[PDB]
């Protein structure tokens, strides 16, 4: 319907409470992936001057304006180590993306 | 009565003496969570350009128009390292809440 | 009846006592969907020189004279941040104007 | 006699000049205590656009329609580190307020 | 036709919803390229005092009034890190230029 | 014919549709180069107290006044980055002063 | 004679070319201690429509009416940083005043 | 008296000279302490990006607003090796303490 | 001849046109130096609300108030780090002001 | 005479010139001892935002509407490593107040 | 003809697309050498609070306002490491500056 | 004369090209030797966050407040294995501070 990219911001800020847990690895992840999508100085502006947990909330924030909000789930499979529960994000991320489609489809 | 939302702004008025304590904890609290309700750039206009304190006044000017002022409570109780004082807080809400409700009643 | 769009305006006066909670949005969300139908001077003419809440009352001054008062229900439902209440606003404006519509009907 | 709140008004212009030493704590103070009695735009309007001192002197301008121009005053004992000078200028004003006194006596 | 350059600012004004999600980059592309056609203090206008979105709004309204408001277009395909999603957006504002100048044919 | 100091009037008049476009930059241009001819008052009072276009309407008012309302063209020469389409707009000056021109031969 | 009252008045308007240059500072500190004189509402009428000279005339043509036109002088003594000059001022009034204080002598 | 909560913020301001000396312990003693009560990103904002005393400064600002600064005291007796003086801080904190609750009886 | 004042305002309104490169050093330069000369609050009045090269306008209009325009000369040999230009600044003040004195000659 | 206190931001104001050489030092020596005149937050508005010298102005300002300009004096004797300058500070210091205490004698 | 200063500065706008390669140096290079005529706490303002590009563009912005824009280009020879590219970037700088010279002969 | 501390901050400008060269022994040096006269935060301000020779520009930032700048040069003839060099710096030292001695006796 080419509306599940506006579907999937939602579903991101509502799961933005499970930030804090797994994006503690933003700069472990995304500055080393998501710089096919983020722009270059973007990583410096969310590393430089924040503390850590607010710093992925200006990172989620960047991302939501993505329509591939899924580049970070892309990522998340790289990187296993993390991926025992981060999977369990994935899963997590994936069921609120359903719910809210089936939402979408009323 | 469905006016007990328009008696939790002036609880919150009564209780913004209390602000410069535990609002500090704005972009800590706030930022990530109330998302869910504040806009996403009134993050951005309450962080930019104050002085972290009148920032927290910002942020529950913004949050009185919301009938639900006790996001911020719901919040409150997660992130338990603070609530040792924070759940006093709440209990302090509280009770200016039951105190404004008793004259609600009247 | 074509006198639909004069009563949306009697709504809108009577609901503007509701301004001052979410019209504090007024350049959050008309000056970058309303720009639509609001004039593009009319914008800064509402920010330039004001005091925040009396801006939103210009703002829906300028609404008032548009007869598609419904661009801001229709802007409110995006950015669905501020919607969780802000709904509940287009709840109470769709009930007003039920209300002025049933009195049009008599 | 129910007339002190009228001079003290008169206290307050012939103090007014120590307004630019002690009210640059404005924002400070009293739009965090003083909504309790101030408007809520009022501390917009005070704040938005003025030049820090003239500021101040809108804010007194308000003050002075009060009675309870003591509402400072209280203010001023909470946040004791400005209270070192700050109590002198409560002794200031209370010596001012005495003189008035002893002209209304007459 | 010489006016096309005047269906662009029409076809802007339609676009400037998708102002919020990708000229959060306004500093971070125009202020470094359009500074060949912005004003060098327009830039500190821009920026000094603003909430990040109003910010690109009033870029996008000093856009407007350049006739080559696909310089913005052109800066879009440098820092191609973006251009993933944001050469969507060059297709998206291509679509809509494309529209409105068939509704100029008429 | 010392006349076409008039026609100059003429031709502004005829020209002050495009006023909204680029005289949004009167205090950016006039007030720092045409204050060889224009009151320094009068700076102030096309600022203090308008809405950023019927501003520029005063300051073309302002300037039709003054028989070289060529002092704007050649402030327009400096600060060329504005100048790749002001340009495009002293050329679309001279046409019209040329047309003007035309008419006055007869 | 208790005529230099009135040539005070007098001294003044003689003087009154001199307002441009330091009673820019008239908000600065006469709505701040001629409050002892000058009307409340009077400070709004100054200030609120006009052009920040004009503004000083009206603020002048008000002190005429006054007899103590020294209350000015005696308030520029305060904040003595502009005082390097508006003591210069302060001599220029006095030259003035002692000439038509010899006139009237004669 | 349930301020004496309020009267410890008080004795910590005026022990604050003492900060420098013995809270360089501060990441070795309140970052696994106090995490009891502080936030664990406060932890990062107090020693990311600061200078090693102001960072006990900021860690000290946190403090007050909890009631419960007494868990600096409960976890400083933690750590005997540090106490040979830090008991003597401790003694001093109290006797500091002790006078404001003099001064609290008046 | 005591009119060299007159005329120096004369010359830096000629010489208006360099503000925009070196009076960008104006909180740099005179909010910390001519506050000998210039209001408190004016060096807030200048900074607090403009953008940046127009708050350079209205510094040197503040500055030509004064006849002791030569302050900001003063100021200018202070802080050679920019003198080295500064300084062709300062031969260029002083080309503009013996032209001017020429021309005062006649 | 209760007037020396007045004197004392006269003597600050023609040695805000020496703020550049060792009030570097703002947050290493006031931030921790004039904390106990100083506002808590106004040390956050000093420091986050402003450019390490401007904010020893803004410091300075904040110190001159306390009577106890000798409070920085009496902390810049402790921390004795910079005093060895410093004092050479404290005795320019006293003698501009001793200059300005002899003028005030007249 | 003295004017080759003045088309400095529009070779460096023409060129500061290629700041974000090579003035990732900024503080590696003017910080310490072009202190020569830079300001000292323009260092800190450029440094302080930025994202590490534009923090290049308000380097440059400061140096289009020094004539001798020449100053970086004699520090890029200093420090050969980067100068087997820099002094590519010479070339295209001297290459620019020809150009615009042939415009200025014209 | 009391201005050689002055012009020693110019002549340590104009060397602070060799500040690369022989002040990546600050730590080693004046960490150790200048806390007589540095502050001992200031040596964890210096080392803490920096990349090893803007360290020692910060260093020499903080030395040229001091009037004995001399001080870095006494400690540099300690540690006479890096003066053999070291005093080819000094030498060179006083062969800048001599040649702004000539330029001051003028």
Known sequence: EEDLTEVKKDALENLRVYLCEKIIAERHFDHLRAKKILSREDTEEI????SSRKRAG?????????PKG????VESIRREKTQNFLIQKITDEVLKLRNIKLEHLK
């Open 70 to 73: 899924l580049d970070t789930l």
């Open 47 to 50: 590393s430089c001057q924040t």
């Open 58 to 66: 200006k990172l989620l924030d960047y991302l939501q304006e993505n």
